[PDB]
Amino acid sequence: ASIFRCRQCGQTISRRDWLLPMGGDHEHVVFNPAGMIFRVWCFSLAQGLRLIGAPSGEFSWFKGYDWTIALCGQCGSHLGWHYEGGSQPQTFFGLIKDRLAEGPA
Amino acid sequence: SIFRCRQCGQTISRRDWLLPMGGDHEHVVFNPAGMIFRVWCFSLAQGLRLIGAPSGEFSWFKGYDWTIALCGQCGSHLGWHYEGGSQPQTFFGLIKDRLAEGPA
Amino acid sequence: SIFRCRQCGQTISRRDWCFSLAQGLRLITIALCGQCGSHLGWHFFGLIKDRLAEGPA
Ligand SMILES: Cc1cc(N)ccc1C(=O)N[C@H]1CCC(=O)NC1=O
Ligand SMILES: Cc1cc(N)ccc1C(=O)N[C@H]1CCC(=O)NC1=O
Ligand SMILES: [Zn+2]
Ligand SMILES: [Zn+2]
Ligand SMILES: [Zn+2]
């Protein structure tokens, strides 16, 4: 019973039970076109976020998925991205590990 | 999909250059210091600096000698170059979490 | 060459021992890693190879 909370405001976001091994690992170190590097943990589900914009396929780290920016729905901190439009799974979250705090349910 | 050094962005390898050694490009191995590594095998890499002389001692890959591979830019230890074997003669075993994957 | 739990590094088995002997498991048989409780296989010990790591003795 471990949960991940927004490090800025404490809202519960996801659960350790929901870690998802995308391509063999739940941890992906990635860089965007601006050269910013993120350590992303993949989760099946989340709550308490606000997904902003329409999904985009441009520069997706995960082939066959479109992404949307995920903010903490409470404080607006950028916590990662939601991925959709794929298969097995259809949808999942890539959340920035350093912006989360893990603790007891 | 390009692999860069996670510490500095040096260009290192490509997803196209992954090599399934023994049926898998990923090997999970431990050294005699008890460190566990998820090693990805690549046919080719660039931007590294190979340090020292090859050694067969404790090689995870039978028939190959290894040389330490640093990031040629920042000096971070990214893995090993393997040589002296067959099919292939040489390849790179890089530590997955010391790389960052992203756009070409 | 020694087989260890990939998740926590518990020693499980070796090259010399589908295994005939293992250590460090808890049989529930479903074989859990005794240390971290990862499902590593069943008891003949059958172990998920992808759930192991290999190194020197
Ligand atoms: C595409 C992009 C352009 C910018 N000017 C700044 C940032 C980004 C960015 O992080 N995009 C991310 C979105 C999620 C993903 O999968 N891949 C990406 O590169
Ligand atoms: C051989 C060795 C001795 C130490 N004192 C510390 C670390 C290491 C080490 O990582 N060696 C690696 C080199 C690459 C290989 O294939 N197998 C290994 O165990
Ligand atoms: Zn928040
Ligand atoms: Zn570097
Ligand atoms: Zn374990």
Residue numbers in the entry:
A (entry chain B): 19 to 123
B (entry chain A): 20 to 123
C (entry chain C): 20 to 36, 60 to 70, 86 to 100, 110 to 123
The authors write:
Nowadays, the E3 ligase substrate receptor cereblon (CRBN), thalidomide’s primary target, is of particular importance in the fields of MGs and PROTACs. However, these CRBN ligands induce the degradation of IMiD neosubstrates and are inherently unstable, degrading hydrolytically under moderate conditions. In this work, we simultaneously optimized physiochemical properties, stability, on-target affinity, and off-target neosubstrate modulation features to develop novel nonphthalimide CRBN binders. These efforts led to the discovery of conformationally locked benzamide-type derivatives that replicate the interactions of the natural CRBN degron, exhibit enhanced chemical stability, and display a favorable selectivity profile in terms of neosubstrate recruitment.
